[PDB]
Every structure is written in C-alpha cells, then in structure tokens.
Amino acid sequence: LAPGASIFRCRQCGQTISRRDWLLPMGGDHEHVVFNPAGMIFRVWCFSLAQGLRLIGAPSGEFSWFKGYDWTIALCGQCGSHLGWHYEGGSQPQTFFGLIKDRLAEGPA
C-alpha cells in the first residue's frame, strides 16, 4: 500500500527515469563505486531498464567499468543533467544502464 520508494526521477527536474523494481545486480551487486580518468568518483546503480534519457554519440569501449560493454553518455532527456551511461555490446545482459545514484530522487509511483 502507497510505496514511497518505487520510482527514480531526475533530481534536477523530476523527469521519470527508472524504478526500484528494475535494479540489476551486475557481478552480484546493483551498486558499483568507480572513477573516471579525471578521478571523479561515482556511486553507480545498475538498472535493466530506464526511460526519459537522451543517449549522446556512439558507444565507446575506452575505460569501460564493465568488462565487454561499450558506453554512451546518458543525459536527462528533459534538463540535460548527466545521469550516467547506457552500456551495450556485451553478454547476459547485452545492455543495461549505469546511473549515478546521487543524481536521482526516489519516491512514490
């Protein structure tokens, strides 16, 4: 009854992005802490599915945090906030989203 932790929205604008139900335990955990080559740390949650994003450019394998996957930058389709990455080109699953947990807001359906 009345769950308050069902939907993830863009923290900056409220755009609908994903659901707790769609969390994906990649390598046995949904949470992955990673750094980019600029040394920025991200707490990434893996989702099987997401919506309301805009995927920018073509995939790159360069410095992929997930073995066998190529990444594309995922912006909030509404406000342009960088919310994470779409991963593709791999196996089991072929694709998923790695979203930056602190750039989302969790709340009711």
Ligand X SMILES: O=C1CC[C@@H](Oc2ccccc2)C(=O)N1
**Does the annotation place 31 within a ligand binding site?**
yes
Give dist(CA 63, CA 27) in Å, integer: 18
Toward Zn ion, which CB reaches closer, 15 or 18?
15
Does the protein bind ligand X through residue 36 (CB under 6 A)?
yes
Candidates 48, 78, 101, 106: give the one binding Zn ion (CB under 5 A): 78
Candidates 24, 55, 65, 101: give the one binding ligand X (CB under 6 A): 65
Scan for tokens 């979203």, then name that residue.
99
Does the protein bind Zn ion through residue 18 (CB under 5 A)?
no
Sheet with 16-19, edge to edge strand ranges:
16-19, 7-10, 104-107
Toward ligand X, which CB reaches closer, 43 or 63?
63
Q: Which two three-digit tokens encode residue 87?
A: 């991963």
